[PDB]
Amino acid sequence: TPLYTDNTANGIALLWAPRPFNLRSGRTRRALDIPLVKNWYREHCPAGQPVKVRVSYQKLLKYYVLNALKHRPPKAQKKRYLFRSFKATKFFQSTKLDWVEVGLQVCRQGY
């Protein structure tokens, strides 16, 4: 067996890559539930920045801490599904439309 292959350093680097790039399986999250810059504003602010952006960093940290501190475990439900009930009803029907078409539709409906 060869000591190393062409994808050995890659695996060793993946061992230390940050989450979720150190995994090889898992679940699917929501586009809302994935924040891209939380790690950016959890870090020390880069040196030589203006006061406004410095205070922006600090305030984002403040609200992040407040959420983390006030979080409470979710409660026990019975898993009732509004849209499933709607579909069960006779007043609604299923179909596939272009998202922009549906957006115009809902704009008109709200108007």
Partner: protein, 111 residues
């Protein structure tokens, strides 16, 4: 349903390389010494601000240092001053530098 996934290591490596521009290339949590949720909780509880950290309203009605009335304990004539006790020292060692540390969190030591 698009619920769960299991990728291969070459796929993970390519995705990591592509996402590189959004990741800070940190291998340890030593970066976040006195800059993690526990340190922020302790600062909020003690009503103090880490230089780069957030700043909240006093959790408990703050004790006025001009109220205490010069006992033998707080006699300023016995103190030996070498370096001012910054907020960081109290955040790092809450129970040794503070009086009445309530709802204070111990911060993870070196890794």
């Amino acid at each position: 349903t698009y619920q769960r996934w299991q990728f291969t290591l070459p796929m993970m490596s390519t995705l990591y390389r592509l996402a590189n521009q959004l990741l800070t290339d940190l291998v340890d949590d030593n970066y976040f010494y006195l800059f993690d949720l526990k340190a922020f909780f302790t600062s909020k509880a003690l009503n103090m601000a880490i230089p780069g950290g957030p700043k909240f309203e006093p959790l408990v009605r703050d004790i006025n240092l001009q109220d205490e009335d010069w006992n033998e304990f707080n006699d300023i004539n016995k103190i030996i001053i070498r370096q001012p006790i910054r907020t960081e020292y109290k955040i790092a060692f809450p129970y040794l530098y503070n009086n009445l540390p309530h709802h204070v969190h111990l911060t993870w030591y070196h890794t």
